[PDB]
Design a protein around this ligand. Structure first.
Ligand SMILES: [K+]
Ligand SMILES: [K+]
Lengths: 392, 392, 390
């Protein structure tokens, strides 16, 4: 067409202050990682080749070692996404047999992924216990039978519940699973690699290393979330299970590509090297209450001149994680702006059609810019784009 | 581990002359493409955001307008890999129902992908017809029944047969398909986008545009083969079928990643722009017989001075496509070497262990460098590595 | 401990108006004297003075219900639990009932939707996800056996994040299209719109939900209705009659007390005396009226030795059983003591005569004033000094 002249996929300025943003492409990547991906993809590589033996070799093989070490699992595996990892795990272990799960955990993440729908297409039988808000242990145990193949737990990533609510301590499931000799599978989904409380964020958000040490047979999660990697189905646990999973032919359709594989490796390397500030998602969530102010007012300083603009700086409690930490509320600083000639709604609309475009949160005709998600070289382009729409 | 300090994924000089090489990571990507991927991954984007509506939209969206226009198909879709495409098509259309395909088309490509084995895990019931070598139309038709959902043909990318062999022309399948009101599915696999004869290579190799205007209902293929794109399952055909496929839960687990999607988009943009020289595979396969020599002797000029080196330049016919054009042979220029002090075999193993490493063809204790697969900036790297090993 | 009653009056300093543990809605003294009068001797419980013969007890109430909800008819059983059980078992025995996966709730310890729907004899057809449920989920599960389209309201909890819910509007449409009836378990027993009282919320009520075309609606008496314990059902005549006719309805029959109390509560409603029903008063109390009451307490506690007293402004949640989402501004009277830890102070406050139940944060004992009566205060002081200074 003539709308195919210029690419439809384009870089976007996130002013929503939502670190994990489903709509905006989730975790962005460090320039360190990306030059590595670029480097790998510019020409040929050792992808499925073992240079030592001069023959073809497993492409997953290196990535695994990282995960095995960082996380502590017996073994591991990686596929296209977590969605597939779930599907793969189910289809491999639970075909035609029962899978027990809480009525509180049967979740739709995104538009196209529904636990029960994919479990059906998985060829597994869903056995749902407890209630929406509350689920005891007696619920999981009571549903065990000759045909129970799997005890599964899903972590509610994109919503939370408050009020009267009960949940089952993972410790309990694993106890149950030993008693009846049923394996425990945990879709964590955020793919948090290590404990959050290390970095100054106080939350009960589960991770690989810790859940592994709990005794959960299998755990999966996304690469592109709290792990701040490329899109990836990350699976870790007991050797005999992973081996069974790898053996499944479906795993071939779910096989990760050169780019993600490399970008992932690099991401993992950073983790071993303990370079947390070099993965953008972690950085953005661990930023200092003052740093946000410092970056907030530097924008106001660039916005005062423009005609017709009332600018304020506010301090607010907002939720920072969209896809990963729904309960989390953190203090941050937003630059609020209002215009005489135009409503905020017509202002956000124009901000979306800009080049480059800018997406911002909105509260009662107060256009807001959360600085948690804003880069330093974004400021310059924000000003330039604000003056071009109104000073045209 | 000790070797975890450094990534195992490293760029590899390809001296094999094998453009599509499974072990070397299939298609390399043009710099223009990688920059766009880079650009996109650097920060937040419109991946799952529709800027015009200011709400979530699908990622697949951006690409499809391109595929449509280029292929001539009614609509299209993209998934992780062609393996997934095949799997997704079968599960979507053929679950619990019979699929007819030739006994000569039931392929294993690579180590992990087997048509019969995937199709079984597909949930689709394999109706095999005809013989390995010979398969007539009557074979196809004869096996049609109330339970026949699908008429499938797979292209034999990785092998061929000689002697007494017969096959069904596609026109015919389409005909049979109209007759019984059953849909025709063709896995090309090589995902060649357009006609090869335009580029000076005379082969009957199938492509999307052509196979669509023959009246095939669904066609799939890999992105990183003869399309020269990133790893992707590429599916094009009738709207009603695509819709059905899209709506499959499993499609979510087959969803392509941010990187490929963007890389893909750029790949297509170049195609639309008819800028073929900028797509590394095509260039490599269209290179002038003369250009080869020009690059070949340019390396020799660099190797004369190095001690103990017997350098020659030879003309040969070797097979350039690894995973796509198995019967094809093309004229090419290898720069062959031998050393008095070292055996070529000990030379090749050292070459594999270099930084960056070098994979080459061996013939009769003579080292060959096929120039078809060799970049201009590799030469300098070659020279520097040869002298560092030999003259040290 | 048979030598004195195990049940006792209790001072709620929790600031939670609907409180499961503390007895839910307290009753207006107007109401309670009416209950008293009736129960003092014989009455026209099941008797028609005009015709000189037997007549039904639920009679008295239902005129009231029908008018205030606008429904064709109504019925009242022991508690909403039974109401739900009764409706399901009457309408859906052996048949399928469609319900969102988000609405299958445990309210309290002993009441679970799926469990009771099981023992109901109804067949549970669950659709959608925990977080999200669309219309197509509901529609798609409709078949020859589908007896009932059921929505349950999440009273004792809520969800935030990515959430999707089915407009009641849409359900009633669905139910007309396939000619299935729609059953809404509100649970809170909100009778009329909240935004009339200055509370801005989408909280569903009988009147509003009846006018939407829901065939049946149930709720508890002792929640946002501020009445005694009661299963309250309103809707279509055909359906109420089927229900009243269930022989189980007779096991779920309300008593003379709750009947009496309930009728008087309703009188109040028709007479538009909202301020005379504790629960509504307590949630509609003015932000300064809480200070005014908070600092009148302080003034009583200054003299007592060893007490550090302050007065704070906070955002807490007022409804325990009914409005789980609602945070409202309120004033707490906070207190510390040098000798005793807050923890040990709390435990002593609960062993008091009369006892006192209060919130706790970080070694700062709090009294929320939202749930405390004027005559409570004198008794607070009198009991604080008797513990600390004994
Ligand atoms: K991928
Ligand atoms: K009763």
């Amino acid at each position: 067409m003539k709308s195919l002249m210029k690419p439809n996929i384009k870089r976007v300025i996130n002013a929503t202050g939502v670190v994990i943003n489903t709509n905006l492409g989730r975790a962005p990547l460090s320039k360190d990682v990306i030059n590595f991906i670029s480097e790998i993809a510019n020409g040929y590589s050792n992808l499925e080749y073992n240079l030592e033996e001069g023959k073809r070799g497993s492409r997953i093989a290196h990535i695994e070692k990282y995960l095995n070490e960082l996380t502590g699992a017996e073994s591991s595996f990686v596929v296209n996404n977590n969605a597939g990892a779930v599907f793969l795990v189910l289809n491999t272990l639970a075909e035609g047999k029962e899978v027990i799960i809480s009525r509180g955990e049967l979740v739709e993440i995104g538009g196209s992924f529904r636990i029960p729908d994919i479990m059906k297409k998985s060829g597994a039988i869903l056995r749902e216990v407890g209630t929406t808000n509350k689920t005891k242990v007696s619920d999981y145990e009571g549903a065990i039978n000759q045909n129970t193949a799997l005890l599964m737990k899903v972590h509610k990533s994109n919503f939370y519940m408050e009020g009267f609510v009960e949940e089952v301590k993972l410790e309990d499931l694993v106890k149950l699973g030993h008693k009846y000799g049923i394996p425990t599978y945990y879709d964590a989904g955020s793919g948090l690699l290590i404990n959050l409380k290390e970095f100054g964020i106080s939350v009960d958000e589960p991770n690989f290393r810790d859940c592994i040490s709990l005794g959960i047979d299998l755990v999966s999660g996304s690469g592109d979330k709290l792990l701040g990697g490329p899109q990836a189905g990350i699976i870790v646990g007991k050797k005999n299970l992973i081996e069974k999973i790898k053996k499944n032919p479906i795993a071939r359709a779910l096989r990760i590509d050169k780019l993600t594989l490399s970008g992932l490796e690099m991401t993992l390397k950073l983790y071993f090297e303990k370079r947390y500030e070099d993965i953008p998602v972690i950085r953005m969530l661990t930023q200092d209450e003052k740093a946000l102010r410092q970056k907030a007012k530097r924008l106001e300083k660039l916005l005062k001149d423009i005609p017709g603009l009332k600018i304020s700086v506010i301090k607010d409690k907002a939720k920072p994680g969209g896809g990963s930490l729904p309960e989390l509320e953190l203090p941050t600083y937003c630059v609020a702006i209002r215009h005489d000639r135009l409503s905020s709604q017509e202002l956000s609309r124009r901000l979306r059609l800009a080049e480059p475009p800018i997406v911002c949160r909105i509260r009662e005709d107060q256009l807001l810019f959360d600085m948690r998600t804003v880069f330093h070289e974004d400021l310059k382009t924000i000003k330039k784009t604000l003056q071009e729409l109104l000073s045209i």
